[PDB]
A = this chain, B = another copy of it.
Amino acid sequence: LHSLVGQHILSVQQFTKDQMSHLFNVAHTLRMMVQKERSLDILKGKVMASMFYEVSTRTSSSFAAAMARLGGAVLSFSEQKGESLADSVQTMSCYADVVVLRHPQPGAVELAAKHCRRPVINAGDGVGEHPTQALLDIFTIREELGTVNGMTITMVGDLKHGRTVHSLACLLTQYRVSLRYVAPPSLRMPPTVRAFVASRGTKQEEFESIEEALPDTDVLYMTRIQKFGQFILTPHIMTRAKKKMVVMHPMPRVNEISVEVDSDPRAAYFRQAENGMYIRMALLATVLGRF
């Protein structure tokens, strides 16, 4: 009842908190079966089409890996004024049981899914919506700290542009949280983001460096800036973060986290990526109606 069977998965909006939880439990069960190395044939005979038109390789790899580890196969669309995307999507759905689609044009992911006879999982659309990233982001917080509820979640870097940070903020208003924003004056959190957050009644506070936002941070959620030192997490700056907290990062990083924070047990940006495989495994299994 709580698995989104045969449906398109375009935004994290569509999950009732109970479908969200079911998804998290199912990813927990898949993980444990993997750890004890069971013969997994859940999606044996099933085919996933991977259609990436903006290149995220964490996304494409985790999804492909996820499908392999269920016993499924992947067809990857490696394919200049060709056919309409919806036709390319329709045709691949003649071969596959589900389509994973990342497209940067606004509207497109949804327009491709529209008359598609198979379920399209959105892996990143034109408005930077990206549900499995949001789902793995929450799932991680709960995994690392026990609970999402009652935490301070601090976001660092280019918050003006990176539209998945703005995905997570809104979704985090379904929980009891306080949101901190670190960002240089030019790249601050946009207003209608902050308006929705306030509109749903979530406490928010802007800070100018990591150092000053840190001692009360439970989740330090880091992001690249691109084109200074007030947004670069270092082991120096870490001597101030609580003992229990976790540092997350959707990846890739370049500058924003020093390699020497990696052996910090609170550094969770690799565990985070692995959680991604497992929630994606759950979404696949669930979308194809086995779990």
Contact = CB atoms under 8 A, between A and B. Distances in A.
A270 B90 contact: yes
B270 A96 contact: no
Contact of A86 (B44, B65, B69, B259): B259
Nearest to A52: B78
A195 interface: no
Interface in A68-110: 68-69, 71, 73, 75-79, 82-84, 86-88, 90-92, 94-96
A263 to B, nearest CB: 9
Copies in the complex: 3
Interface string A37-51: 111110011010100
Interface stretch (A3-11, A55-63, A170-178): A55-63
A88 B57 CA distance: 9
Contacts of A86: 259
A34 interface: yes
A212 interface: no
A61 to B, nearest CB: 5
Contacts of A73: 65, 68-69
Interface stretch (A16-24, A153-161, A181-189, A249-257): A249-257
Given A47-B65, A55-B79, A87-B251, 5 more contacts: A39-B41, A61-B75, A61-B92, A65-B96, A86-B259
24 contacts: A45-B69, A47-B65, A57-B78, A58-B91, A61-B91, A61-B95, A62-B95, A64-B75, A65-B73, A65-B96, A69-B73, A76-B76, A82-B254, A86-B259, A87-B251, A87-B252, A91-B251, A91-B270, A91-B273, A94-B270, A94-B274, A94-B277, A95-B273, A117-B270
In the A-B complex, the 10 residue pairs with the closest CB atoms: A68-B73, A65-B95, A83-B252, A94-B274, A94-B273, A57-B79, A82-B254, A37-B45, A61-B75, A64-B75
